[PDB]
Amino acid sequence: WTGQESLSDSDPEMWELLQREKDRQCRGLELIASENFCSRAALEALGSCLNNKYSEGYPGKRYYGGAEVVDEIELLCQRRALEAFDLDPAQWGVNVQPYSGSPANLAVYTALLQPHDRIMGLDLPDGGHLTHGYMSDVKRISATSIFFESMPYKLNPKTGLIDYNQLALTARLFRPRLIIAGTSAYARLIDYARMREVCDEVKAHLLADMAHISGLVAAKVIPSPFKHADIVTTTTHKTLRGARSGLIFYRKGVKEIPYTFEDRINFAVFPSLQGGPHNHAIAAVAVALKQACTPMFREYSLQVLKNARAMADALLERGYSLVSGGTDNHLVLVDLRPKGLDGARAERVLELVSITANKNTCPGDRSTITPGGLRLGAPALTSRQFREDDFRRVVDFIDEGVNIGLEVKSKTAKLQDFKSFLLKDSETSQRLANLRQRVEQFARAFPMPGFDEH
Amino acid sequence: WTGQESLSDSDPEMWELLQREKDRQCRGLELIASENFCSRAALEALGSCLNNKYSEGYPGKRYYGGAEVVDEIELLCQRRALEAFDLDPAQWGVNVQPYSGSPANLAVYTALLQPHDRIMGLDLPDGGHLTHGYMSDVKRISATSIFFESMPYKNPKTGLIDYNQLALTARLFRPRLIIAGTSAYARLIDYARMREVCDEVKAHLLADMAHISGLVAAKVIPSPFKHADIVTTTTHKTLRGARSGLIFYRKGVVDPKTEIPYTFEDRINFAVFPSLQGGPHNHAIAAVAVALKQACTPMFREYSLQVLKNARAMADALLERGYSLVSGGTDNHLVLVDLKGDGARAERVLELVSITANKNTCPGDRSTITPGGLRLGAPALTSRQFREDDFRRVVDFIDEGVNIGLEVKSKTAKLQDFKSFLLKDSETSQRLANLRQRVEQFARAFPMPGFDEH
Amino acid sequence: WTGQESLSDSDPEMWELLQREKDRQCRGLELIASENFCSRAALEALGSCLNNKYSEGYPGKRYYGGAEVVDEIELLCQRRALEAFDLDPAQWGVNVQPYSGSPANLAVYTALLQPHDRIMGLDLPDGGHLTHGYMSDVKRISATSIFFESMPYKLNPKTGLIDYNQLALTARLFRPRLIIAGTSAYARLIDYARMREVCDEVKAHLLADMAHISGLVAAKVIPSPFKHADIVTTTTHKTLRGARSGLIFYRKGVKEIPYTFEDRINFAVFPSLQGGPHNHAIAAVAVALKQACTPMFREYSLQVLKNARAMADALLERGYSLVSGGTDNHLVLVDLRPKGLDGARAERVLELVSITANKNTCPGDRSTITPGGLRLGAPALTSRQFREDDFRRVVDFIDEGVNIGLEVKSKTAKLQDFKSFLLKDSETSQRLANLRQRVEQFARAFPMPGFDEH
Amino acid sequence: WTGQESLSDSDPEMWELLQREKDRQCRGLELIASENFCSRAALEALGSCLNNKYSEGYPGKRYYGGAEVVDEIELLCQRRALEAFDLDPAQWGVNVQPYSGSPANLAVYTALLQPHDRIMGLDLPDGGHLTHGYMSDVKRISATSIFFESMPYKNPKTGLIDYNQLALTARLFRPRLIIAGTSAYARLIDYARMREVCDEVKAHLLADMAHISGLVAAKVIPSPFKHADIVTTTTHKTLRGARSGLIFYRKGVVDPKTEIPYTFEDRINFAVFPSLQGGPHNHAIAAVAVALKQACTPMFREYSLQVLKNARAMADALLERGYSLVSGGTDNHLVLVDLKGDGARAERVLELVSITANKNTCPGDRSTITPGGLRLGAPALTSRQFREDDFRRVVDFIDEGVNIGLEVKSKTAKLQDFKSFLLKDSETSQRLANLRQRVEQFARAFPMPGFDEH
Numbered sequence A, C: 001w002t003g004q005e006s007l008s009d010s011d012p013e014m015w016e017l018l019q020r021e022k023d024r025q026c027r028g029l030e031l032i033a034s035e036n037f038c039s040r041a042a043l044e045a046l047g048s049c050l051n052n053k054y055s056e057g058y059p060g061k062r063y064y065g066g067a068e069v070v071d072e073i074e075l076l077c078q079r080r081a082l083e084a085f086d087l088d089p090a091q092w093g094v095n096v097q098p099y100s101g102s103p104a105n106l107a108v109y110t111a112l113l114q115p116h117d118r119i120m121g122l123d124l125p126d127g128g129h130l131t132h133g134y135m136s137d138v139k140r141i142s143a144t145s146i147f148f149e150s151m152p153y154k155l156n157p158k159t160g161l162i163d164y165n166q167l168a169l170t171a172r173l174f175r176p177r178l179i180i181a182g183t184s185a186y187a188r189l190i191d192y193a194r195m196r197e198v199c200d201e202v203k204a205h206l207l208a209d210m211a212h213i214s215g216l217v218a219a220k221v222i223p224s225p226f227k228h229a230d231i232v233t234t235t236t237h238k239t240l241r242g243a244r245s246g247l248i249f250y251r252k253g254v255k256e257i258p259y260t261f262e263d264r265i266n267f268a269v270f271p272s273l274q275g276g277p278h279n280h281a282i283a284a285v286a287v288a289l290k291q292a293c294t295p296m297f298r299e300y301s302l303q304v305l306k307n308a309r310a311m312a313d314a315l316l317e318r319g320y321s322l323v324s325g326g327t328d329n330h331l332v333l334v335d336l337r338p339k340g341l342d343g344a345r346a347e348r349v350l351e352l353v354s355i356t357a358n359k360n361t362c363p364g365d366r367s368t369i370t371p372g373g374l375r376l377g378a379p380a381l382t383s384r385q386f387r388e389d390d391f392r393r394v395v396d397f398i399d400e401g402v403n404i405g406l407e408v409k410s411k412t413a414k415l416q417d418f419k420s421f422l423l424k425d426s427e428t429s430q431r432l433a434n435l436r437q438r439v440e441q442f443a444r445a446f447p448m449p450g451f452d453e454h
Numbered sequence B, D: 001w002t003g004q005e006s007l008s009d010s011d012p013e014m015w016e017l018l019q020r021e022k023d024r025q026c027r028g029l030e031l032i033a034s035e036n037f038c039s040r041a042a043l044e045a046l047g048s049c050l051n052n053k054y055s056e057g058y059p060g061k062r063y064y065g066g067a068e069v070v071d072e073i074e075l076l077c078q079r080r081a082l083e084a085f086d087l088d089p090a091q092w093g094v095n096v097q098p099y100s101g102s103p104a105n106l107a108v109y110t111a112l113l114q115p116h117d118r119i120m121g122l123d124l125p126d127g128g129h130l131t132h133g134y135m136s137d138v139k140r141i142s143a144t145s146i147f148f149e150s151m152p153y154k155n156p157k158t159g160l161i162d163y164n165q166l167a168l169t170a171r172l173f174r175p176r177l178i179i180a181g182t183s184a185y186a187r188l189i190d191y192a193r194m195r196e197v198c199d200e201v202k203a204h205l206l207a208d209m210a211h212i213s214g215l216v217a218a219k220v221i222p223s224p225f226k227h228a229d230i231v232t233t234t235t236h237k238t239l240r241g242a243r244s245g246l247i248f249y250r251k252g253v254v255d256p257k258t259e260i261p262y263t264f265e266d267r268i269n270f271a272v273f274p275s276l277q278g279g280p281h282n283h284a285i286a287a288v289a290v291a292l293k294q295a296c297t298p299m300f301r302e303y304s305l306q307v308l309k310n311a312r313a314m315a316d317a318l319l320e321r322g323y324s325l326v327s328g329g330t331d332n333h334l335v336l337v338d339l340k341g342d343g344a345r346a347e348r349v350l351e352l353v354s355i356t357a358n359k360n361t362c363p364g365d366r367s368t369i370t371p372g373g374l375r376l377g378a379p380a381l382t383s384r385q386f387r388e389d390d391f392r393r394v395v396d397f398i399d400e401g402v403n404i405g406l407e408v409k410s411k412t413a414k415l416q417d418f419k420s421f422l423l424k425d426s427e428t429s430q431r432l433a434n435l436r437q438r439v440e441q442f443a444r445a446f447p448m449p450g451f452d453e454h
């Protein structure tokens, strides 16, 4: 035994499963807005010997030894994190140690707020994330709502946009100490300036979760939340096209009233919440971050917008509804209830063809288990050199998939009856197999970032 | 740009900086009990395309689609984890989604305890970790102490802990979960004693197997999986996998008067998602499944069986030459010196000679800035096929470093001037480089798991 | 020494002070809405040997002895508490042990809600009480807002009434577990049915604080909050005209879904919060409670309404503003800003004449230390056999007092300058002395409940 | 109806039922260490017209008007309280507004501690009270344990507490305030030991003088007012006043390196109002001011000096006839029997003979439903001018009751049949009424403080 053996030789069972996923990604139309395809250069850094380095602490302020050059990669990851978002190293710091996006948000709360302090974020069915404080009417399900007292703000159901007026009214009576300005399912750009004015009135910190749109912010193709918010969090595996980690950006220097964000946030990530940093992920983020400073990444993010706008205008002419009218970023929200189908049936219909999407509730729904919409993303296929005409054909396969699920809903009743009919009825099982072949052949022709084997 | 370019061509920086890490892992003898050198097969799954998949949920119940492959990779890792520790699938279940060891422990707290409820663990300055409930008496450091009221447990004479002063403070603090785990402790823990002492106070037994994880899977050191109810661990230490976490929870059933099932697996799986974290790191789940398959092989048990006799030979070689073991022996994998002359003084002279360790507070130390004890680790170099006479030489290499350090401790002034004249004086850098030379020549000759370049 | 000596003989210093207060109450026009004049029969029961009886527990469920006949007075106090409000002894229980109104509300919260649970009450400047959860924009000042998370609902500034629509909107997003339906400064009757509909939608307990209006509810001259709310609290020293204590009324029996209010509320008062019950106060409340069942008390409460309505219509013809238009209960809220004077100056002007009132903020004020209104009560003087024509003359003295403070504000600037000018300037000091004599001579002619000496 | 009618004419019920209470207080010998017979002068101020005044606020800063008299009555009570315990007004302040002893203690917790912060007091089954932080290990009883995490302190051999096991659990629980008070304990508390043990753990010393309040004012028992920082007490026990509470807090200043004032009096006065309670009970504040004026007289010290030698004669008379004192003596005012034969069995046979006591858990009792110890009290009958030979007779009266109880304990079946055959069997009611007869004839002959009728 030496540990240098091959995965294909040491574990052919796992190498087979790990090889069956790559072809599914090659043959599938990934429309999930949160998913991308990480480059090869960042993946071989994520699966490297940096997994074998304990660097608890921070560069210079390490508690153990052996972090000679590991400190240099964390400083490199910090220096290009600010460079990718055009930040002064004297006015903005960055913490690269968050394991993912969810631990990144929890670190901001523990650093700035006391337990049971008041949190305001967009409600989950309206487009907010779990970590922005979410509670059902039955019990608290997000830990942000267990350790802190959260209260959500809703959309304007007429326009589908965030009700900034209702947020101003609600914050004046709830008196939050931190308001989250970030989205998981929202086609337009958040008015971060209006957010800042509401925060300054009730004396609250403005946290901007840049997770879905950070790649567009890095390319400067959409307004940057750094110009109004003073605490920015983001994942690095969505539009950033890197490994699964998290970044926390904070103001630094003087606000002389000093900005006291640098010391508490770094203390919340370690030693409060996390322990050993995933240095293999840090270097993978830094590889993707320097890719974000290149003119290629701006051309990539510019294409993600027009690709989402292309499918958005493509779905409209087919007779589809889009909440908030259309789209200004990377994801479109299709409203399926005007056509007689719901997101639950459509998500299962499109998945059996390898068009991976996700259900999403629409303003006005009262069903939970049967949402009337889907969230379709662009940056996944756009990294595969997809362009406008390619996304127009993606929607053509969507419609022919929706049209299938429409006639199946006429032959079936409950949702449990629906998923059993798509696999039993060979007349529909063959009709689904035809679009599957016609979708997988259209998808394999496009290049795929990363390794060609695994 | 396609995303398939090599790291050496795309980021010529990050390529060199990582090759300096693998060089350091080969140039030096790593002896931090928590560190290890993972196998090449597992890291290929760590740098996989599974980094791209969003699989929020669990096998069976998932909120997305296109998860056909990752579902079987997760169920494979759960079955490989249950087999690696010889657990009946009907009596035990495992969640394989925690990002690391620290998040795995916080998930068990959120699941079984309400906010500000009471836990008990051995103190960090007494051989514990931050995630067990450590507060600095002037500040609440870890989030284990901010969201849950923890009482630190600590006997300095026996070298062991005070396993009945814990029972003394048990009924007077009345905890709901006591932690039986170690971060810097050389002896075993009476797992039959920790259980009944939790039953008389109506508490839950939590075993944090993070350091002993390998010595338990190989059935060479007694296991907690029939005395404890919930078990958390790292896939990092002694298991030689990627950096992630595991939560071993009981499952199943007897109320003979007037049926009594376990209530664990629905709450801890809800704590991991959607409470604490979001999208699982499938590349980490697949990587640790490779290490778990290796853990069921006799090649891993003989590797484990070597670690104990390597640590025993490590302590005896130090015992035979004027060094006190803070236990009277060690069946674990680490040592505990009483450096009869301090702790923080040895690390600087070691890491400059390409040998890294960490400070350790010995029972009786009145300080924390200049402690008196080093914790050296066997699993790291044992994975490089180190054996008895190979480790006996390692204790002789530290000998010349500690013996030169005792000469610098006789000079200079406080800890600041210790590290000052080392990288400044001309004559002192002679024994620095000579001992580093022979240490590098002795280390590079051993095989190194993982890739050859990165 | 024997302890049977007279207060006039044992302590002539305290007997002098205690005698100077009674004449101030005899000579003064008490317009504070929360104040009344307790009868002699209830006062000599409040200052009796029942002070010398430890009866911790409840009748029958006593922990010590000696409560032979003390148990009978608590059952008598309970039986007439329900009788005074026309409650079925099988559908309503009552706890008479609360020391006062503030401990009564805190007992309801601790019995029904967990720490940091969500509370909704009327904001303090809008007419709510402290114990209904009040927080400034700077810090939490009420213990209800420290142990529980409170959020206030506001008035409709156009109509001066509670904004039930905004409360329905706010409760749907705040998700409270208890909503308070009670007032301290509100001239109209709360729509308790609308309150109940909002509580049943967000699944919250409806607590009605009957403190100011319980005498009107006992006489059945205003709608009873018992017909919609299931938890009712009240003081017994306002319109109840008894000692200073508190009552908690709760549903009992079946809601078979049982009502689980009786056991938890009785446990929160004792042993959770309070200790030894003030049995002298319990019997004093029972004396006043049986007075509330008499036809005299209904004629008294009927007069309190028309006396408040008389002064309300009297103030209107003098050119005064009343928020919410007028009055439907016992207290009128005068808005003084249309006349150029504020409640701070008027309260000090009327106090120096022995017309005791209190400042009160008005909808739209932004001054705190200079409120633009006053809260004038009726049940205090109405118990002195005051009638409509008498209250019309009370307002005549008010106007001539306001007219004084109007011309003083022209000769002065800051509020600290104002209170120093009313005592220095002998030209105004004599003008105030004239209305003082003309007010005290009008007040002494009316009878005064209680002892004629102390 | 005018409100000036006597209680005997208005409520002929309540008149008779109270005269049965004074009859019972005269017919029987009260020996509950907490009970007392208040003076006639204080109760005249308790049944005063000050019950009618709303004086929310403090002398100087009040939110109302017409408080000229009650302001001086409050400042008089503060000065009489500082003098009664010999405190410099510049070094000590007192708040006289707590409704009772339990609210006074909760106010000190809210003022100096944040929610869920940590306190330490002696356990209720070990001689404590609920307000010191008692939880039933299966439920959190007192609100001291619901809003603050309390650890109960407890040595059964010495009879005393374990005054260094408290130090054993001190640094391991790290409280912010330890309580030095007693509800059922016969010895004194080392006040110099409680202070330094709180200083090494950075805690506050709270002395709850509720039972020893009289023995401290008379300067016959050592005082905590130069070792402790905050002191709470009842005006009820040994002080022979109305039922209320007092909060003695330090005030004033020394930072010789690089001025250091006390930070107590602004927070505890804010905790009493407007945090916890609202309107003060001015009739109680005036009543206790009368008892405080009596406490500064030599007639009260010789009364106090009698209580100790009465309790010492009470214990020695019991010691001389086969009874064990749970201390080895008593300098307090209470006893502690080991009833060598139970506790709950004696109270029923006593209160039926017109002598009342209470259960007391002796160190070593495995039960709580049938404890083994009675706590008899001296201050009650000492106030009736009881002396040595008078109390020596009281121990001889209980003798025949306990000796008949040992015969019933030899019969019947469990505690249920003990009290069953007492009020049912014909022959058993003979020694019942005979011993009650001579006990009533012996009790009615002594003078009784307070009024003659009520």
Ligand SMILES: Nc1nc2ccn(CCCCc3ccc(C(=O)N[C@@H](CCC(=O)N[C@@H](CCC(=O)O)C(=O)O)C(=O)O)c(F)c3)c2c(=O)[nH]1
Residues within 6 Å of the ligand: A124, A125, A126, A127, A128, A129, A130, A131, A136, A141, A184, A185, A358, A360, A361, A364, A365, A366, A367, A368, B056, B063, B274, B278
């Ligand atoms: N934007 C957004 N997308 C996505 C996609 C994946 N993620 C991350 C993973 C999230 C997983 C998840 C989601 C929901 C619940 C949940 O608990 N759901 C409620 C009903 C919700 C609802 O929508 N209720 C009403 C609303 C009011 C109305 O309009 O009536 C309805 O629409 O019916 C319930 O099942 O109890 C849950 F437990 C776990 C997100 C995200 O965080 N954010």
Ligand SMILES: Nc1nc2ccn(CCCCc3ccc(C(=O)N[C@@H](CCC(=O)N[C@@H](CCC(=O)O)C(=O)O)C(=O)O)c(F)c3)c2c(=O)[nH]1
Residues within 6 Å of the ligand: C124, C125, C126, C127, C128, C129, C130, C131, C136, C141, C184, C185, C358, C360, C361, C364, C365, C366, C367, C368, D056, D063, D274, D278
């Ligand atoms: N109804 C009502 N009457 C009465 C009368 C007596 N009691 C019981 C005793 C209460 C004592 C008390 C009252 C207020 C504060 C307080 O803290 N007050 C704020 C500013 C308040 C305000 O009104 N702020 C704004 C409102 C928003 C706007 O309209 O702008 C303004 O009006 O300016 C501050 O001083 O900080 C306090 F500490 C203590 C009550 C009661 O509870 N209820």
Ligand SMILES: Cc1ncc(COP(=O)(O)O)c(CNCC(=O)O)c1O
Residues within 6 Å of the ligand: A033, A034, A100, A101, A102, A103, A129, A131, A182, A183, A184, A185, A209, A211, A212, A235, A244, B054, B277, B278, B279, B280
């Ligand atoms: C705002 C936001 N924050 C965090 C996350 C996820 O954090 P992790 O990287 O820890 O999973 C998401 C993705 N949420 C799922 C989706 O949008 O599809 C998100 O939209």
Ligand SMILES: Cc1ncc(COP(=O)(O)O)c(CNCC(=O)O)c1O
Residues within 6 Å of the ligand: A054, A274, A275, A276, A277, B034, B100, B101, B102, B103, B129, B131, B181, B182, B183, B208, B210, B211, B234, B236, B243, B244
């Ligand atoms: C006993 C124990 N448990 C859990 C963890 C958490 O592991 P992560 O850092 O991967 O979250 C650690 C960290 N171990 C630090 C050390 O001994 O060097 C640990 O020592």
Ligand SMILES: Cc1ncc(COP(=O)(O)O)c(CNCC(=O)O)c1O
Residues within 6 Å of the ligand: C033, C034, C100, C101, C102, C103, C129, C131, C182, C183, C184, C185, C209, C211, C212, C235, C244, D054, D277, D278, D279, D280
């Ligand atoms: C609704 C309410 N609750 C409680 C209280 C007072 O509780 P205490 O009896 O414990 O003080 C008041 C009187 N608040 C003052 C006023 O209205 O003038 C009140 O209006």
Ligand SMILES: Cc1ncc(COP(=O)(O)O)c(CNCC(=O)O)c1O
Residues within 6 Å of the ligand: C054, C274, C275, C276, C277, D034, D100, D101, D102, D103, D129, D131, D181, D182, D183, D208, D210, D211, D234, D236, D243, D244
């Ligand atoms: C030591 C102590 N402190 C405070 C209190 C509270 O007093 P109130 O019940 O007046 O709030 C008590 C009650 N004493 C009960 C007894 O010993 O009989 C007590 O014993």
